[PDB]
Amino acid sequence: YAHSQSLDRLMNPLIDQYLYYLSKTINGSGQNQQTLKFSVAGPSNMAVQGRNYIPGPSYRQQRVSTTVTQNNNSEFAWPGASSWALNGRNSLMNPGPAMASHKEGE
Amino acid sequence: DGVGSSSGNWHCDSQWLGDRVITTSTRTWALPTYNNHLYKQISNSTSGGSSNDNAYFGYSTPWGYFDFNRFHCHFSPRDWQRLINNNWGFRPKRLNFKLFNIQVKEVTDNNGVKTIANNLTSTVQVFTDSDYQLPYVLGSAHEGCLPPFPADVFMIPQYGYLTLNDGSQAVGRSSFYCLEYFPSQMLRTGNNFQFSYEFENVPFHSSYAHSQSLDRLMNPLIDQYLYYLSKTINGSGQNQQTLKFSVAGPSNMAVQGRNYIPGPSYRQQRVSTTVTQNNNSEFAWPGASSWALNGRNSLMNPGPAMASHKEGEDRFFPLSGSLIFGKQGTGRDNVDADKVMITNEEEIKTTNPVATESYGQVATNHQSDGTPFKAQAQTGWVQNQGILPGMVWQDRDVYLQGPIWAKIPHTDGNFHPSPLMGGFGMKHPPPQILIKNTPVPADPPTAFNKDKLNSFITQYSTGQVSVEIEWELQKENSKRWNPEIQYTSNYYKSNNVEFAVNTEGVYSEPRPIGTRYLTRNL
Amino acid sequence: PSPLMGGFGMKHPPPQILIKNTPVPADPPTAFNKDKLNSFITQYSTGQVSVEIEWELQKENSKRWNPEIQYTSNYYKSNNVEFAVNTEGVYSEPRPIGTRYLTRNL
């Protein structure tokens, strides 16, 4: 099955949280303007909302385009690949940890 | 079971039967008509636009839902004090929920005069999502819980949910849920609703602080039988390389071999409550730890459970590594530091690394004399450390005004699914109880019209809700000789009693209360 | 511990019976608000209360020969009957009445 909800969009989009976040650290331009301002994390700012669970582990891979003109004009299949070493031997991280292949639209 | 007979009684007290606590809470609620009985698609576009990180897509339903996922919904401050001062742990065991004394009222506004009358034949709809087929919006630290003060009347929050989005748009995998597709019990006045829920097995919450640190678990009088490399050069000058070893003992506790190491870390930016010590720049968003998901950046808040600050650095707090509660009457946007209550996670510095410090140092090269660069030993800071075997840690504390439980996401894999905001993580948490006033149409036209009716009698409902939770207790049996730290009120005089009402009848919670006052060995 | 104002002193006296009208909120806003409701339908209640008390008596068995002092009304004419209502329906107690009229030896 595929999830119809994302980990960062599990909240109620109509109700604020009772938690606060640091929203402003300076009152404005100029010297000695330091401050601490806090705001309610709500529907308008979903990025800063407190969350209970976070995305799984990652092991970054090199990005290759099926449109070959967008790729770098160099040989990077082996040199640019993620790998792990075992007893001095390098082995390709293939396919490695389960990760999303690409972003939306890519 | 009629108009003139009450369908329930007010039950609000706690019973301490040894190793168990049964807390009962009754409140008076008011349910309006949400969304004019309509399901509405919502998105950041309909909310006025936003950035990519804030984009969403979802629906707002005409249903309300009952929230009691906060500890002050069940524990009075005195009951909380008893629990935290006399117990090493606690966990929920059973739940009982009651809806009764339903009153549906119609509102007519003629010539600006508002008159409210009883609608005896109107019905309120309620059901529980016992199969967890709906998006779970509890466990997101939302408002709308039962008020901490039993005398307060609260409004039931409106139920909405989010699905997959591509900007402000939906994708083919997005799901639309109609809550009228569920069987629900229809209640007139005189009817009541009741259901029982059994909490699944969860570990006891650690309502204790360790009196030993992970790096001080040894006998301070006896040497180890293990050696460590203590000297690599005999002295100043060329070709002085050597290898000297010493016994790891009480004089050098830092180099002693150890069996267990501090838990995982994800470094947070350090912010001082003394604003003059902070940098003169805007770094709330730019300087914050975050994780990316499908190209969207989300704040790491509160993230892994880590010590808030080092010893003596009480003025420092992680940028988004702690729960920040608002004081009574605090506004929504851009409030001062004195209007919020920043929770302090200091009791776990014995096992968990400090949130604003590096986990440690790792070697980054091979030191050598040649073969031919003459490289010295180099180390690099570990800003984020994942789980390693032999690592121990403490979870985040729970608070009187903090959350109780969260639903573990239904995924193939998870590790230590205890909620990051604190509480008990369950695959089958208490189900969502969804409530809604049944629409009562106004007079329809005398000629048939295929269009759905859009004129309704203005209505709202009120009633009483009772929640009874039985908690299992883990009694402390410490052999510590000296008296422990306990939560206590301060005898010094004040204008108002803490955790009481002021002269205007406004109840307030002056400070956050954790659970970790008693002491346990490591 | 006999009360100084007079009466029977008890460690467990008749308990306080506390009564209150359950608040009935007025129409709440159609958008959620976290604040407690402060607009209510104006209400009051009325009813009947019945109290029944059984008192134990200590009968007098005096051997005194002469007649005792008793509380009595005065036959002399007056505008109103004592311990009755006046022409406006106002009930009044004209004097305080004690309990100590009969006689006992020391």
UniProtKB/TrEMBL annotation, chain A:
Give its localization. Answer: Virion
Q: State the source organism's domain of life.
A: Viruses
Please list the residues that bind beta-D-galactose.
Answer: N45, W78
Q: Which family does it belong to?
A: Belongs to the parvoviridae capsid protein family.
Name of the protein in question:
Capsid protein VP1
- Origin organism is Adeno-associated virus 9
Q: Quick one: which gene encodes this?
A: cap
What range of the full-length protein does this chain span? 426 to 531 of 736
